[PDB]
Amino acid sequence: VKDQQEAEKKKVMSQEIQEQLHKQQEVIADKQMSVKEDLDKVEPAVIE
Amino acid sequence: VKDQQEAEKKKVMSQEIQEQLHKQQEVIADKQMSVKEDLDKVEPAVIEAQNAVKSIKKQHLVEVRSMANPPAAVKLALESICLLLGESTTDWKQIRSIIMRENFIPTIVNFSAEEISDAIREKMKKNYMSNPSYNYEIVNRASLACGPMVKWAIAQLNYADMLKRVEPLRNELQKLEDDAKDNQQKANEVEQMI
């Protein structure tokens, strides 16, 4: 029972990981904006 | 497995209950201080309330019919009537206010928190002008009727203006009591469900 309960505390940690997947969505959105800016700006520097 | 997990979640509610037992320790400390204050203050009021019942009809009735009131009785009776919403300084209004048979009831009904701070300060100044009066000529032999009621009147002013020190105390006590009693009902009821 206690082994299962430690497993389910780690499942609560997995709920925290789902929160971190929401954080991943935020990260992906911000990185998409930054990479769009980088595609606008950096490529001519690479060509140069 | 799920049932045991729910039982542990209730045991987690029980852990919150240990936090509420720490809150109980805080509540007990605050209540002990408040009850020490109450033991310092209230017991003479209880004695005065009992003495008001001990007061005999004859002692008051004979002296109400008196043609001229003694100065000590006037001094100690005007302030008592200042409590009774009949603020006045004339002997006949005192007589009329005391005549009714409905005046044997509110010798105990009057409560300390109903007094206004300005009236409290007025009666403090009256005490200053009349410090040798009150309980001293009660001890002398001014009248048997005045004694209990005069000692009742000299009180209720100590309670005032330091019950306002207890007002934040009792408000914090009420908040803690409400939270802790709800949490202890949860403790008993959560214990039952677990």
Side-chain angles (χ1 to χ4, degrees), chain B residues 45 48 78-85 87 109-124 126-127 134 152-164 167:
Chain B
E48 293 149 27
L78 294 173
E79 305 195 64
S80 74
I81 292 168
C82 300
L83 293 166
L84 307 178
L85 305 163
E87 298 183 338
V109 175
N110 313 120
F111 182 58
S112 48
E114 298 170 316
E115 299 191 85
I116 296 172
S117 66
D118 304 290
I120 299 161
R121 291 172 179 185
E122 279 199 357
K123 297 176 185 182
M124 295 298 102
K126 299 161 191 165
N127 289 325
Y134 287 91
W152 151 78
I154 197 54
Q156 286 166 339
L157 301 173
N158 288 342
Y159 302 98
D161 286 4
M162 82 205 168
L163 284 167
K164 299 179 180 161
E167 286 168 3

mmCIF file of all heavy atoms in Angstrom, chain B residues 45 48 78-85 87 109-124 126-127 134 152-164 167:
data_model
loop_
_atom_site.group_PDB
_atom_site.id
_atom_site.type_symbol
_atom_site.label_atom_id
_atom_site.label_comp_id
_atom_site.label_asym_id
_atom_site.label_seq_id
_atom_site.Cartn_x
_atom_site.Cartn_y
_atom_site.Cartn_z
ATOM 1 N N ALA B 45 -18.581 41.947 40.013
ATOM 2 C CA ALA B 45 -19.871 42.206 39.376
ATOM 3 C C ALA B 45 -20.869 41.100 39.688
ATOM 4 O O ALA B 45 -22.057 41.369 39.896
ATOM 5 C CB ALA B 45 -19.709 42.361 37.865
ATOM 6 N N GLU B 48 -22.053 41.720 43.162
ATOM 7 C CA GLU B 48 -23.004 42.828 43.172
ATOM 8 C C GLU B 48 -24.363 42.399 42.633
ATOM 9 O O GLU B 48 -25.408 42.815 43.145
ATOM 10 C CB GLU B 48 -22.453 43.994 42.354
ATOM 11 C CG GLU B 48 -21.225 44.644 42.946
ATOM 12 C CD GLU B 48 -20.317 45.214 41.882
ATOM 13 O OE1 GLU B 48 -20.829 45.564 40.799
ATOM 14 O OE2 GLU B 48 -19.095 45.308 42.124
ATOM 15 N N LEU B 78 -27.739 59.549 41.153
ATOM 16 C CA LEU B 78 -27.820 60.256 39.877
ATOM 17 C C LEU B 78 -27.043 59.522 38.789
ATOM 18 O O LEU B 78 -27.543 59.339 37.671
ATOM 19 C CB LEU B 78 -27.309 61.689 40.027
ATOM 20 C CG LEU B 78 -28.129 62.636 40.906
ATOM 21 C CD1 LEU B 78 -27.408 63.963 41.086
ATOM 22 C CD2 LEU B 78 -29.512 62.851 40.318
ATOM 23 N N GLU B 79 -25.826 59.075 39.105
ATOM 24 C CA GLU B 79 -25.013 58.361 38.130
ATOM 25 C C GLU B 79 -25.617 57.018 37.744
ATOM 26 O O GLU B 79 -25.475 56.599 36.590
ATOM 27 C CB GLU B 79 -23.599 58.162 38.677
ATOM 28 C CG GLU B 79 -22.929 59.453 39.112
ATOM 29 C CD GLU B 79 -21.436 59.295 39.310
ATOM 30 O OE1 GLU B 79 -20.731 59.006 38.321
ATOM 31 O OE2 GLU B 79 -20.967 59.464 40.455
ATOM 32 N N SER B 80 -26.278 56.332 38.679
ATOM 33 C CA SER B 80 -26.941 55.076 38.345
ATOM 34 C C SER B 80 -28.068 55.297 37.343
ATOM 35 O O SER B 80 -28.235 54.511 36.404
ATOM 36 C CB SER B 80 -27.472 54.409 39.613
ATOM 37 O OG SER B 80 -28.620 55.081 40.099
ATOM 38 N N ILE B 81 -28.856 56.358 37.533
ATOM 39 C CA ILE B 81 -29.923 56.675 36.592
ATOM 40 C C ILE B 81 -29.365 57.160 35.259
ATOM 41 O O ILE B 81 -30.003 56.963 34.218
ATOM 42 C CB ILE B 81 -30.886 57.692 37.233
ATOM 43 C CG1 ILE B 81 -31.626 57.024 38.390
ATOM 44 C CG2 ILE B 81 -31.887 58.228 36.221
ATOM 45 C CD1 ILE B 81 -32.369 57.978 39.267
ATOM 46 N N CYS B 82 -28.174 57.767 35.257
ATOM 47 C CA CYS B 82 -27.525 58.085 33.987
ATOM 48 C C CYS B 82 -27.323 56.850 33.116
ATOM 49 O O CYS B 82 -27.243 56.979 31.890
ATOM 50 C CB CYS B 82 -26.178 58.776 34.218
ATOM 51 S SG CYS B 82 -26.254 60.342 35.117
ATOM 52 N N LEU B 83 -27.235 55.661 33.720
ATOM 53 C CA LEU B 83 -27.228 54.420 32.951
ATOM 54 C C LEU B 83 -28.592 54.119 32.339
ATOM 55 O O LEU B 83 -28.671 53.561 31.239
ATOM 56 C CB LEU B 83 -26.801 53.248 33.836
ATOM 57 C CG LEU B 83 -25.373 53.202 34.368
ATOM 58 C CD1 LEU B 83 -25.258 52.182 35.484
ATOM 59 C CD2 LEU B 83 -24.447 52.834 33.229
ATOM 60 N N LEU B 84 -29.669 54.483 33.031
ATOM 61 C CA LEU B 84 -31.011 53.995 32.714
ATOM 62 C C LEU B 84 -31.726 54.846 31.675
ATOM 63 O O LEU B 84 -32.960 54.880 31.649
ATOM 64 C CB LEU B 84 -31.830 53.907 33.997
ATOM 65 C CG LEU B 84 -31.183 53.108 35.132
ATOM 66 C CD1 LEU B 84 -32.063 53.121 36.374
ATOM 67 C CD2 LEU B 84 -30.888 51.683 34.690
ATOM 68 N N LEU B 85 -30.978 55.562 30.830
ATOM 69 C CA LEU B 85 -31.529 56.323 29.711
ATOM 70 C C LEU B 85 -32.437 57.455 30.177
ATOM 71 O O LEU B 85 -33.041 58.153 29.356
ATOM 72 C CB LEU B 85 -32.283 55.397 28.750
ATOM 73 C CG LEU B 85 -31.498 54.207 28.196
ATOM 74 C CD1 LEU B 85 -32.439 53.166 27.611
ATOM 75 C CD2 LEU B 85 -30.489 54.667 27.154
ATOM 76 N N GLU B 87 -31.433 60.190 31.964
ATOM 77 C CA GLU B 87 -30.456 61.159 32.453
ATOM 78 C C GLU B 87 -31.133 62.396 33.032
ATOM 79 O O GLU B 87 -31.811 63.139 32.314
ATOM 80 C CB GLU B 87 -29.503 61.557 31.323
ATOM 81 C CG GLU B 87 -28.689 60.399 30.766
ATOM 82 C CD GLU B 87 -27.708 60.836 29.696
ATOM 83 O OE1 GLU B 87 -27.925 61.907 29.089
ATOM 84 O OE2 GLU B 87 -26.720 60.110 29.462
ATOM 85 N N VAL B 109 -29.956 43.487 34.604
ATOM 86 C CA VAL B 109 -29.977 43.467 33.143
ATOM 87 C C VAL B 109 -28.891 44.369 32.564
ATOM 88 O O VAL B 109 -28.311 44.060 31.515
ATOM 89 C CB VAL B 109 -31.377 43.857 32.632
ATOM 90 C CG1 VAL B 109 -31.389 43.972 31.115
ATOM 91 C CG2 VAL B 109 -32.408 42.839 33.096
ATOM 92 N N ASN B 110 -28.600 45.489 33.226
ATOM 93 C CA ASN B 110 -27.632 46.445 32.696
ATOM 94 C C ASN B 110 -26.289 45.769 32.438
ATOM 95 O O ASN B 110 -25.768 45.045 33.291
ATOM 96 C CB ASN B 110 -27.452 47.617 33.662
ATOM 97 C CG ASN B 110 -28.769 48.184 34.147
ATOM 98 O OD1 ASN B 110 -29.046 48.200 35.345
ATOM 99 N ND2 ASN B 110 -29.590 48.658 33.216
ATOM 100 N N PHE B 111 -25.735 46.010 31.254
ATOM 101 C CA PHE B 111 -24.525 45.347 30.797
ATOM 102 C C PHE B 111 -23.435 46.383 30.543
ATOM 103 O O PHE B 111 -23.716 47.532 30.189
ATOM 104 C CB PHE B 111 -24.802 44.530 29.530
ATOM 105 C CG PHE B 111 -23.611 43.775 29.015
ATOM 106 C CD1 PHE B 111 -22.967 42.848 29.816
ATOM 107 C CD2 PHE B 111 -23.153 43.969 27.723
ATOM 108 C CE1 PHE B 111 -21.876 42.143 29.347
ATOM 109 C CE2 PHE B 111 -22.064 43.264 27.247
ATOM 110 C CZ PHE B 111 -21.424 42.351 28.061
ATOM 111 N N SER B 112 -22.184 45.961 30.726
ATOM 112 C CA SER B 112 -21.049 46.877 30.724
ATOM 113 C C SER B 112 -20.755 47.488 29.359
ATOM 114 O O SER B 112 -20.283 48.629 29.304
ATOM 115 C CB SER B 112 -19.798 46.159 31.236
ATOM 116 O OG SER B 112 -19.634 44.902 30.603
ATOM 117 N N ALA B 113 -21.018 46.776 28.265
ATOM 118 C CA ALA B 113 -20.661 47.255 26.936
ATOM 119 C C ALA B 113 -21.643 48.276 26.379
ATOM 120 O O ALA B 113 -21.376 48.856 25.321
ATOM 121 C CB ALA B 113 -20.541 46.079 25.963
ATOM 122 N N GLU B 114 -22.767 48.515 27.058
ATOM 123 C CA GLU B 114 -23.741 49.486 26.577
ATOM 124 C C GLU B 114 -23.352 50.923 26.901
ATOM 125 O O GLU B 114 -23.992 51.851 26.397
ATOM 126 C CB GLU B 114 -25.121 49.188 27.167
ATOM 127 C CG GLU B 114 -25.694 47.837 26.771
ATOM 128 C CD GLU B 114 -26.943 47.483 27.554
ATOM 129 O OE1 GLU B 114 -26.950 47.681 28.788
ATOM 130 O OE2 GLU B 114 -27.919 47.009 26.937
ATOM 131 N N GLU B 115 -22.327 51.126 27.724
ATOM 132 C CA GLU B 115 -21.952 52.471 28.139
ATOM 133 C C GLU B 115 -21.151 53.179 27.053
ATOM 134 O O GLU B 115 -20.390 52.550 26.312
ATOM 135 C CB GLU B 115 -21.152 52.415 29.439
ATOM 136 C CG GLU B 115 -21.921 51.812 30.597
ATOM 137 C CD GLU B 115 -21.220 52.016 31.920
ATOM 138 O OE1 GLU B 115 -21.402 53.086 32.536
ATOM 139 O OE2 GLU B 115 -20.494 51.100 32.349
ATOM 140 N N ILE B 116 -21.328 54.496 26.970
ATOM 141 C CA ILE B 116 -20.642 55.343 26.002
ATOM 142 C C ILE B 116 -19.415 55.953 26.669
ATOM 143 O O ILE B 116 -19.428 56.272 27.862
ATOM 144 C CB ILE B 116 -21.602 56.423 25.457
ATOM 145 C CG1 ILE B 116 -22.752 55.767 24.692
ATOM 146 C CG2 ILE B 116 -20.873 57.408 24.554
ATOM 147 C CD1 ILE B 116 -23.844 56.731 24.284
ATOM 148 N N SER B 117 -18.342 56.116 25.888
ATOM 149 C CA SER B 117 -17.070 56.578 26.442
ATOM 150 C C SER B 117 -17.201 57.952 27.089
ATOM 151 O O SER B 117 -16.564 58.225 28.114
ATOM 152 C CB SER B 117 -16.002 56.601 25.348
ATOM 153 O OG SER B 117 -16.305 57.570 24.360
ATOM 154 N N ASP B 118 -18.008 58.837 26.498
ATOM 155 C CA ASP B 118 -18.204 60.158 27.088
ATOM 156 C C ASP B 118 -18.871 60.058 28.455
ATOM 157 O O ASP B 118 -18.481 60.763 29.394
ATOM 158 C CB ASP B 118 -19.028 61.036 26.147
ATOM 159 C CG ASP B 118 -18.402 61.162 24.772
ATOM 160 O OD1 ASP B 118 -17.347 61.820 24.657
ATOM 161 O OD2 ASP B 118 -18.965 60.603 23.808
ATOM 162 N N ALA B 119 -19.874 59.187 28.588
ATOM 163 C CA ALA B 119 -20.489 58.961 29.892
ATOM 164 C C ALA B 119 -19.488 58.359 30.871
ATOM 165 O O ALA B 119 -19.504 58.683 32.065
ATOM 166 C CB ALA B 119 -21.711 58.056 29.747
ATOM 167 N N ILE B 120 -18.611 57.482 30.382
ATOM 168 C CA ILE B 120 -17.584 56.891 31.235
ATOM 169 C C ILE B 120 -16.665 57.975 31.785
ATOM 170 O O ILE B 120 -16.342 57.993 32.975
ATOM 171 C CB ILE B 120 -16.793 55.823 30.457
ATOM 172 C CG1 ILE B 120 -17.727 54.705 29.996
ATOM 173 C CG2 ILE B 120 -15.666 55.263 31.311
ATOM 174 C CD1 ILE B 120 -17.168 53.877 28.865
ATOM 175 N N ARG B 121 -16.238 58.901 30.923
ATOM 176 C CA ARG B 121 -15.363 59.983 31.368
ATOM 177 C C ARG B 121 -16.096 60.932 32.312
ATOM 178 O O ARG B 121 -15.511 61.434 33.283
ATOM 179 C CB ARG B 121 -14.813 60.738 30.160
ATOM 180 C CG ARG B 121 -13.836 59.924 29.329
ATOM 181 C CD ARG B 121 -13.475 60.633 28.036
ATOM 182 N NE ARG B 121 -12.511 59.870 27.252
ATOM 183 C CZ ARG B 121 -11.948 60.299 26.132
ATOM 184 N NH1 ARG B 121 -12.230 61.490 25.629
ATOM 185 N NH2 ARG B 121 -11.082 59.514 25.497
ATOM 186 N N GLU B 122 -17.377 61.188 32.042
ATOM 187 C CA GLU B 122 -18.180 62.005 32.946
ATOM 188 C C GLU B 122 -18.235 61.382 34.335
ATOM 189 O O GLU B 122 -18.065 62.070 35.347
ATOM 190 C CB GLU B 122 -19.591 62.178 32.382
ATOM 191 C CG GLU B 122 -19.724 63.254 31.322
ATOM 192 C CD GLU B 122 -21.160 63.707 31.141
ATOM 193 O OE1 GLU B 122 -22.050 63.141 31.808
ATOM 194 O OE2 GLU B 122 -21.398 64.629 30.332
ATOM 195 N N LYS B 123 -18.458 60.069 34.398
ATOM 196 C CA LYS B 123 -18.534 59.404 35.693
ATOM 197 C C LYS B 123 -17.163 59.277 36.345
ATOM 198 O O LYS B 123 -17.071 59.241 37.574
ATOM 199 C CB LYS B 123 -19.208 58.044 35.538
ATOM 200 C CG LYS B 123 -20.642 58.176 35.061
ATOM 201 C CD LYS B 123 -21.301 56.841 34.808
ATOM 202 C CE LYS B 123 -22.679 57.054 34.212
ATOM 203 N NZ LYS B 123 -23.389 55.776 33.983
ATOM 204 N N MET B 124 -16.089 59.235 35.553
ATOM 205 C CA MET B 124 -14.753 59.336 36.135
ATOM 206 C C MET B 124 -14.556 60.684 36.818
ATOM 207 O O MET B 124 -14.041 60.750 37.941
ATOM 208 C CB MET B 124 -13.682 59.120 35.064
ATOM 209 C CG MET B 124 -13.643 57.726 34.453
ATOM 210 S SD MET B 124 -13.285 56.421 35.646
ATOM 211 C CE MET B 124 -14.917 55.734 35.910
ATOM 212 N N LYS B 126 -16.922 62.589 37.963
ATOM 213 C CA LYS B 126 -17.779 62.549 39.144
ATOM 214 C C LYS B 126 -17.134 61.758 40.275
ATOM 215 O O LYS B 126 -17.279 62.123 41.447
ATOM 216 C CB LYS B 126 -19.148 61.968 38.782
ATOM 217 C CG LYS B 126 -19.902 62.791 37.745
ATOM 218 C CD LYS B 126 -21.004 61.998 37.069
ATOM 219 C CE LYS B 126 -21.557 62.756 35.871
ATOM 220 N NZ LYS B 126 -22.370 61.883 34.981
ATOM 221 N N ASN B 127 -16.423 60.678 39.947
ATOM 222 C CA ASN B 127 -15.644 59.967 40.954
ATOM 223 C C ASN B 127 -14.567 60.866 41.547
ATOM 224 O O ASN B 127 -14.354 60.871 42.762
ATOM 225 C CB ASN B 127 -15.015 58.713 40.345
ATOM 226 C CG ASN B 127 -16.037 57.638 40.038
ATOM 227 O OD1 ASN B 127 -17.017 57.470 40.762
ATOM 228 N ND2 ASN B 127 -15.813 56.901 38.956
ATOM 229 N N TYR B 134 -19.263 57.060 47.963
ATOM 230 C CA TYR B 134 -19.446 55.684 47.503
ATOM 231 C C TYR B 134 -19.261 54.663 48.620
ATOM 232 O O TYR B 134 -19.906 54.743 49.675
ATOM 233 C CB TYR B 134 -18.485 55.352 46.351
ATOM 234 C CG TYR B 134 -18.820 55.996 45.023
ATOM 235 C CD1 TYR B 134 -18.293 57.233 44.682
ATOM 236 C CD2 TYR B 134 -19.656 55.365 44.110
ATOM 237 C CE1 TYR B 134 -18.593 57.830 43.474
ATOM 238 C CE2 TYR B 134 -19.962 55.956 42.896
ATOM 239 C CZ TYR B 134 -19.426 57.187 42.585
ATOM 240 O OH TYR B 134 -19.723 57.781 41.380
ATOM 241 N N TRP B 152 -22.705 48.207 42.884
ATOM 242 C CA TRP B 152 -22.981 47.865 41.492
ATOM 243 C C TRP B 152 -22.662 49.038 40.572
ATOM 244 O O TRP B 152 -22.113 48.863 39.477
ATOM 245 C CB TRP B 152 -24.443 47.433 41.342
ATOM 246 C CG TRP B 152 -25.029 47.708 39.984
ATOM 247 C CD1 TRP B 152 -24.827 46.983 38.847
ATOM 248 C CD2 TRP B 152 -25.923 48.772 39.627
ATOM 249 N NE1 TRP B 152 -25.533 47.532 37.803
ATOM 250 C CE2 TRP B 152 -26.213 48.631 38.257
ATOM 251 C CE3 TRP B 152 -26.502 49.830 40.334
ATOM 252 C CZ2 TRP B 152 -27.056 49.508 37.577
ATOM 253 C CZ3 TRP B 152 -27.339 50.701 39.657
ATOM 254 C CH2 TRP B 152 -27.608 50.534 38.294
ATOM 255 N N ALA B 153 -23.007 50.252 41.008
ATOM 256 C CA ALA B 153 -22.783 51.437 40.188
ATOM 257 C C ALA B 153 -21.306 51.796 40.088
ATOM 258 O O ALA B 153 -20.850 52.232 39.025
ATOM 259 C CB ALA B 153 -23.576 52.618 40.745
ATOM 260 N N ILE B 154 -20.546 51.634 41.175
ATOM 261 C CA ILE B 154 -19.115 51.931 41.125
ATOM 262 C C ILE B 154 -18.402 50.965 40.187
ATOM 263 O O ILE B 154 -17.348 51.286 39.624
ATOM 264 C CB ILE B 154 -18.503 51.919 42.540
ATOM 265 C CG1 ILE B 154 -17.148 52.635 42.544
ATOM 266 C CG2 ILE B 154 -18.335 50.501 43.055
ATOM 267 C CD1 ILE B 154 -17.186 54.035 41.979
ATOM 268 N N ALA B 155 -18.965 49.773 39.998
ATOM 269 C CA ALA B 155 -18.432 48.843 39.013
ATOM 270 C C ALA B 155 -19.007 49.161 37.640
ATOM 271 O O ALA B 155 -19.656 50.197 37.461
ATOM 272 C CB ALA B 155 -18.737 47.397 39.404
ATOM 273 N N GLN B 156 -18.736 48.290 36.664
ATOM 274 C CA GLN B 156 -19.167 48.434 35.274
ATOM 275 C C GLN B 156 -18.401 49.555 34.583
ATOM 276 O O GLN B 156 -18.489 49.714 33.363
ATOM 277 C CB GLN B 156 -20.679 48.666 35.177
ATOM 278 C CG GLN B 156 -21.510 47.424 35.449
ATOM 279 C CD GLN B 156 -22.974 47.738 35.680
ATOM 280 O OE1 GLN B 156 -23.335 48.863 36.026
ATOM 281 N NE2 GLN B 156 -23.830 46.741 35.484
ATOM 282 N N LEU B 157 -17.612 50.311 35.349
ATOM 283 C CA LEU B 157 -16.768 51.339 34.755
ATOM 284 C C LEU B 157 -15.325 50.862 34.659
ATOM 285 O O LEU B 157 -14.580 51.289 33.769
ATOM 286 C CB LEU B 157 -16.866 52.631 35.565
ATOM 287 C CG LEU B 157 -18.268 53.237 35.685
ATOM 288 C CD1 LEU B 157 -18.276 54.409 36.654
ATOM 289 C CD2 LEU B 157 -18.789 53.665 34.324
ATOM 290 N N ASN B 158 -14.915 49.976 35.570
ATOM 291 C CA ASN B 158 -13.653 49.271 35.396
ATOM 292 C C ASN B 158 -13.694 48.362 34.177
ATOM 293 O O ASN B 158 -12.722 48.314 33.419
ATOM 294 C CB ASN B 158 -13.326 48.447 36.644
ATOM 295 C CG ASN B 158 -12.911 49.306 37.823
ATOM 296 O OD1 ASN B 158 -12.537 50.467 37.662
ATOM 297 N ND2 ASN B 158 -12.976 48.735 39.022
ATOM 298 N N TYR B 159 -14.820 47.681 33.954
ATOM 299 C CA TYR B 159 -14.971 46.845 32.770
ATOM 300 C C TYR B 159 -14.889 47.692 31.509
ATOM 301 O O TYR B 159 -14.199 47.335 30.547
ATOM 302 C CB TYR B 159 -16.309 46.110 32.841
ATOM 303 C CG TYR B 159 -16.446 45.260 34.078
ATOM 304 C CD1 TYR B 159 -17.141 45.729 35.183
ATOM 305 C CD2 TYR B 159 -15.832 44.024 34.171
ATOM 306 C CE1 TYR B 159 -17.258 44.977 36.330
ATOM 307 C CE2 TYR B 159 -15.952 43.262 35.310
ATOM 308 C CZ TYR B 159 -16.660 43.743 36.390
ATOM 309 O OH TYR B 159 -16.766 42.989 37.533
ATOM 310 N N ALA B 160 -15.563 48.837 31.515
ATOM 311 C CA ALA B 160 -15.485 49.763 30.399
ATOM 312 C C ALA B 160 -14.059 50.267 30.221
ATOM 313 O O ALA B 160 -13.317 50.436 31.193
ATOM 314 C CB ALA B 160 -16.438 50.934 30.625
ATOM 315 N N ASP B 161 -13.670 50.457 28.960
ATOM 316 C CA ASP B 161 -12.399 51.059 28.565
ATOM 317 C C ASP B 161 -11.210 50.129 28.782
ATOM 318 O O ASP B 161 -10.082 50.474 28.417
ATOM 319 C CB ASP B 161 -12.180 52.390 29.290
ATOM 320 C CG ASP B 161 -13.049 53.499 28.735
ATOM 321 O OD1 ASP B 161 -13.879 53.210 27.847
ATOM 322 O OD2 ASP B 161 -12.898 54.657 29.177
ATOM 323 N N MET B 162 -11.436 48.952 29.374
ATOM 324 C CA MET B 162 -10.459 47.883 29.209
ATOM 325 C C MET B 162 -11.105 46.580 28.762
ATOM 326 O O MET B 162 -10.395 45.590 28.555
ATOM 327 C CB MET B 162 -9.634 47.657 30.483
ATOM 328 C CG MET B 162 -10.252 46.811 31.584
ATOM 329 S SD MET B 162 -9.519 47.255 33.176
ATOM 330 C CE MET B 162 -10.603 46.435 34.340
ATOM 331 N N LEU B 163 -12.433 46.553 28.612
ATOM 332 C CA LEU B 163 -13.037 45.596 27.696
ATOM 333 C C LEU B 163 -12.732 45.953 26.251
ATOM 334 O O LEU B 163 -12.694 45.061 25.397
ATOM 335 C CB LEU B 163 -14.553 45.519 27.893
ATOM 336 C CG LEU B 163 -15.093 44.751 29.100
ATOM 337 C CD1 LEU B 163 -16.572 45.051 29.293
ATOM 338 C CD2 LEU B 163 -14.861 43.256 28.952
ATOM 339 N N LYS B 164 -12.508 47.239 25.967
ATOM 340 C CA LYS B 164 -12.016 47.653 24.661
ATOM 341 C C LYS B 164 -10.597 47.171 24.403
ATOM 342 O O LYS B 164 -10.190 47.078 23.242
ATOM 343 C CB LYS B 164 -12.082 49.175 24.526
ATOM 344 C CG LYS B 164 -13.486 49.740 24.645
ATOM 345 C CD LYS B 164 -13.478 51.252 24.524
ATOM 346 C CE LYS B 164 -14.881 51.821 24.645
ATOM 347 N NZ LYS B 164 -14.856 53.273 24.970
ATOM 348 N N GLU B 167 -11.767 43.708 23.448
ATOM 349 C CA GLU B 167 -12.506 43.629 22.188
ATOM 350 C C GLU B 167 -11.671 43.072 21.042
ATOM 351 O O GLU B 167 -12.149 42.149 20.361
ATOM 352 C CB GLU B 167 -13.087 45.002 21.833
ATOM 353 C CG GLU B 167 -14.282 45.420 22.673
ATOM 354 C CD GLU B 167 -14.642 46.879 22.479
ATOM 355 O OE1 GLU B 167 -13.995 47.546 21.644
ATOM 356 O OE2 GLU B 167 -15.573 47.360 23.159
#
